[PDB]
């Protein structure tokens, strides 16, 4: 078909992918990539300004090992902490954890003590780096909060912790 | 993306110039003030108006002077006190003169005209 040695074509374009006069086409051109980069950045900083004195991402995610045998050693972020990790950290109310900015995942359990201890100490360094503002602005004020932590609420860009992969690495 | 309204598009700008209404042609047909007026009111340019004096400063009638008697905003023209021209027959007609050529020698000074002068004169 070639009069040569080129491989067997295997082209896979038999089904009107081309936007001609008769067809609408199956083509999507990503010319918006450039503008959408800036737009995503702008809406991300608008999210920050909206939920200002809080992490820009906002919930503390756990660290879970990637799934298969190929990615066993690679760690990453989860969806939320297990209620066992919460109870070990000192939190027995999932809804209160969520309201103060710790993410919960009742679907997850700890299949081992290492994940439990790791995410427990993660939550415990949280809740100490954490400055809770008091409700109604002048009532009780928690421990550690020094009355100028409320004067200077700083929005950090990344959550204090190291990279997620830096736990398998 | 450039923000809205401040666009240097030739086609859009020319469309705007050639489809402007009369209240926009009033400000497109603005003229420069003499130095007397400019020092007196601390304002540099105004929209030209009927009943005020101009000096032509350009064109085949440069150095001539006279009171404006017609703003023909449809043609972007301005007719002047005595810049006339005979037709084929003896009928004298007016010559349109784009007000960018003329400078302004006097004003009529209506109430809104004086208020405009004051508002543009207060330096900020």
């Amino acid at each position: 078909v070639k009069k040569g040695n080129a491989p067997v074509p295997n082209a896979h374009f038999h089904k009107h992918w081309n936007p001609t006069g008769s067809q609408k086409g199956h083509v999507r051109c990503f010319f918006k990539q450039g503008p959408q980069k800036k737009i995503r950045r702008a809406r991300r900083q608008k999210k920050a300004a909206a939920v200002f004195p809080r992490p820009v991402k906002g919930p503390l995610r756990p660290i879970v090992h990637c799934k298969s045998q190929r990615f066993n050693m690679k760690t990453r972020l989860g969806r939320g902490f297990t209620t066992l990790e919460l109870k070990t950290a000192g939190l027995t109310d999932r809804r209160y954890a969520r309201t103060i900015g710790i993410s919960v995942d009742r679907r997850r359990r700890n299949h081992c003590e290492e994940s439990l201890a790791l995410n427990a100490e993660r939550i415990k360094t949280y809740l100490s780096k954490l400055v809770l503002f008091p409700l109604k602005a002048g009532k009780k004020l928690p421990e550690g909060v020094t009355e100028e932590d409320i004067k200077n609420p700083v929005q950090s860009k990344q959550d204090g912790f190291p990279k997620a992969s830096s736990y398998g690495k | 993306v450039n923000k809205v309204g401040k666009s240097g598009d030739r086609r859009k700008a020319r469309k705007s110039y050639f489809t402007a209404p009369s209240h926009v042609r009033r400000v497109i047909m603005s003229a420069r003030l003499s130095k007397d007026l400019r020092q007196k009111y601390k304002v540099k340019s105004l929209p030209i108006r009927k009943e005020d004096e101009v000096k032509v400063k350009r064109g085949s009638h440069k150095g001539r002077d006279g009171k404006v008697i017609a703003c023909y905003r449809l043609k972007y023209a301005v007719h002047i006190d005595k810049i006339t021209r005979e037709k084929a027959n003896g009928q004298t007609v007016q010559i349109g003169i784009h007000p960018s050529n003329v400078e302004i020698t006097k004003l009529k000074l209506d109430k809104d005209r004086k208020k405009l002068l004051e508002t543009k004169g207060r330096r900020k």
Binding site: K15, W17, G25, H26, V27, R28, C29, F30, F31, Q33, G34 | -
Partner: protein, 102 residues
């Protein structure tokens, strides 16, 4: 559900259920809700039916029987080419994507 929803155009079709079946016909009962009734609009639990996006769920396959015949009973590996739609899925994996740099 479709026949009842086309006959009663100003109502909203929530679930139906088999009530009877003989040699000639199968009989179903369809629950419909009047979206412009004060009781409906007041009770939050059904208040979502009064939004303009909920018109003709029977016509669009949003009801339970629709979700059934659209393959949406199952999820995971038994509803592979089902979500978010069969045609949406087909489009999404028959799309020719031309990035700026390729």
């Amino acid at each position: 559900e479709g026949r009842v929803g086309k006959h009663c155009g100003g109502l909203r079709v929530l679930n139906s259920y088999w009530v009877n079946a003989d040699a000639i016909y199968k009989y179903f009962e369809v629950i419909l809700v009047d979206p412009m009734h004060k009781a409906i609009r007041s009770d939050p639990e059904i208040n979502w039916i009064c939004k303009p996006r909920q018109k003709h769920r029977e016509a669009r396959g949003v009801t339970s029987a629709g979700r059934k015949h659209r393959g949406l009973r199952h999820k995971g590996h038994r509803a592979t080419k089902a979500r978010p739609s069969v045609r949406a899925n087909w489009k999404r994996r028959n799309l020719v994507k031309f990035w700026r740099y390729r």
